[PDB]
Subunit: 230 residues, 4 copies
């Protein structure tokens, strides 16, 4: 199956598969059961920002989520991604909804990779036909230039049981055997609105094998990334 | 047929079809018959460097070729590429040999585009299997990490009647209806060695429609870019 | 006297020293009387954006001003800036008021120089004590993180007969004898509000000798750059 | 006294003041007695490369030293620089010799810093009179465009008992009250030649209070950074 590394903004506590009993950000290494989590003070209706970083000498993957004026949540995990990921990968964003729902709106996205070659892209607006994105599932761009990862209505209300992803078109070379150091950094901003008492399910930035696709049965709590909850 | 904009390093004068009667650099807008040329101050067997720039406010496409800072050649052409290229393009390098030949060896390649969105890539080495490149024709990477656009013997001798290109995998968004300014910059370094008194044929950097392919009959003098010499 | 290259956003027509009789953007080379101008559709109270670019192979200095949802104004001038500028410079922003007035509020500023060596800075907020800026005249930063080039009261009301500049602290190496190409790009966003029927005087981005200071007599129509109107 | 954070490339084991008994790289937090070290297979006469990285979320400072076709040396250390350094710093390079000696030749240096505002500089050659560096002590640039941190003769032969440093002219803003994440990355390439059987003393990259100067008594084993060995 696919090989997945991800940072999850997990809106809904699925304590039956190991989630903590609160909204959380987490670091997922080949399993939906995060190797490290931190409590996330989710704020419906406000734009948030996530920053993600990794360095192969440090061997530490880190993420921070924040909102204007409010305080930040951070999570880190010690890992050597070279013992986890292949040499070439793709990078993307995923989101799901399930029985409960929320908008999974992406307002901007940037990524930089360096191998010692380099790759850098940034979107502050998404076009009507983003030919540099591989859109999977229900993901689509709307009339305002925003990336709606899961289905939203004509008037802006989210739908349940929706899944979608967006991958950057070009593969990324993140290691080699003559390699001295590799790094990446990513940023995205997002807007989550929900009519539900308990919004669900979440948003991820993830890194996978180049031929990755939405797995069978990855809806809801599995965030469009994993085929099961092992 | 493809839509083509290129900067050509034309080592062999094909007066047949409008080449000036000397090795030259040129700017090609939808034709092999350059809109602007300059006599090429060459140094065969030395590493040369090419810098290409364009800005949609200035409406000026420019290139400089130099050899370790010496022996400079420049060419420029006033043009609004918005009325020439489609909104989404691919960018790449091409080269050919013909009856006469030369190595068409790329040692590095970088490109940056900004729309007001941005894309930047840079290769100081080419891997044995570059998954972020679309290799076409005879193009390949060798054991020293160099990109050989045309065929070279296992001992380094160039072969004749060869054609090859390398395209960056992801499409590039160069214009948009509400655009204020768009720009791009490209750099590459090359090594041309030849056993012939009259080496041939040349190297280009080019921009094209995303689905561009080597046209039939585009070898030698046509630089792997055009179907005919109109 | 200093040596000045500047892009001016001139809100007030001073027809006795060569201004066209409307608000205009212009390119200034060692004189307040612009080498090139374009009619500027000035919109008080709306945030504007300026992009400026130069390449030494193209030899074209270009600028564009725009507002969200409105048309753009562009101006260009053909020039080899190494005939005008020293090898080392400082880059900066300037603004004035006179009998009539306006706010000269800078919200963000970025600059990139490349010498084929590079320098790049970007500010999206100015700190209360910006130790990487040389503040001259009346320039200061306010509580909102904005750079007020000319004086405003505690209520935000602009004052007349004010002059102010901000220089980036580090000298920039914009030309070098071994260089094959030199380039720079600059962007700023600005907010000009005014209670006057004819607001005045203007904002510039400029490049000057490293020890540039506000010349005596440079108020008002001279934009804080020039000692006279020759 | 100054406040110093440094990455040391230490050629000479001074075991009386805490050095391991072999050449080593180390991370120095307000003391020459490194908080973390790694054994360094130093190779005189070959160009080496150092990459340094830090991110305020991961809170890990790391460094890697490599030569062409050799194994790398890595060192890391967990630290929150917000508790160590002031908000505004200068960044620089230092080197010493003592009774024993070596060339401390810097061929290139680059630095990037981001605060969530950004600063980036890169030198692949140094000017013979660099107006954007603060040179201290014996440091100077030569006619080849290399930065000689310690003295060399007309012949290129290094001198003993030398100390020199080079700081980038612009202060850097590495933290603030409302900061969410700060990061930096640095690279330099160096050539250490020596005629001595035990070369000495070393090279550093360092971050300090903006007004830092060479401390009295900082020669030799104190690397031009510290006044004592506590
Ligand atoms: O969207 C939130 C969740 O909705 C569903 O889970 C349930 C939430 N409340 C329930 C009540 C009953 C049953 Br049966 C189920 Cl599966 C659920 C499932 O779709 C989950 O995967 C998802 O995380
Ligand atoms: O490599 C140089 C050139 O060689 C060929 O053209 C010829 C130039 N002189 C000739 C002489 C004989 C024959 Br057959 C041919 Cl095809 C040619 C063709 O391959 C040209 O397209 C190419 O530019
Ligand atoms: O701010 C707009 C202008 O005001 C002044 O010039 C005048 C414009 N209208 C006037 C009317 C009367 C007198 Br006195 C003066 Cl100095 C002026 C001067 O300060 C000019 O430098 C400036 O351009
Ligand atoms: O450059 C190498 C070393 O030389 C000096 O230390 C000595 C090393 N071996 C010695 C032998 C004799 C005497 Br006296 C001295 Cl100072 C030393 C001192 O300068 C040290 O700080 C330095 O690290
Ligand atoms: Ca969950
Ligand atoms: Ca030809
Ligand atoms: Ca005026
Ligand atoms: Ca030592
Ligand atoms: Mn979870
Ligand atoms: Mn030609
Ligand atoms: Mn004017
Ligand atoms: Mn030591």
């Amino acid at each position: 199956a696919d090989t997945i590394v991800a940072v999850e903004l997990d809106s809904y506590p699925n304590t039956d598969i190991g989630d903590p009993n609160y909204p959380h950000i987490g670091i997922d290494i080949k399993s939906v059961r995060s190797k490290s989590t931190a409590r996330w003070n989710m704020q419906t209706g406000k734009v948030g920002t996530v920053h993600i970083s990794y360095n192969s000498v440090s061997k530490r993957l880190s993420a921070v989520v924040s909102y204007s004026g409010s305080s930040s949540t951070t999570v880190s995990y010690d890992v050597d991604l070279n013992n986890v990921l292949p040499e070439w990968v793709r990078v993307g964003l995923s989101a799901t909804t399930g029985l409960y729902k929320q908008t999974n709106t992406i307002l901007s996205w940037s990524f930089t990779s360096k191998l010692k070659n380099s790759l850098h892209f940034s979107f502050h607006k998404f076009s009507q036909n983003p030919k540099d994105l591989i859109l999977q599932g229900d993901a689509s761009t709307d009339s305002d230039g925003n990336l709606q990862l899961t289905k939203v209505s004509s008037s802006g209300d989210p739908q349940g049981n929706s899944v979608g992803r967006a991958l950057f078109y070009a593969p990324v070379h993140i290691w080699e055997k003559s390699a001295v150091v590799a790094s990446f950094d990513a940023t995205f901003t997002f807007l989550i609105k929900s009519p539900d008492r308990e919004p669900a399910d979440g948003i991820t930035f993830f890194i996978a094998n180049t031929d990755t696709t939405i797995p069978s049965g990855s809806g809801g709590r599995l965030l469009g990334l994993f085929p099961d909850a092992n």
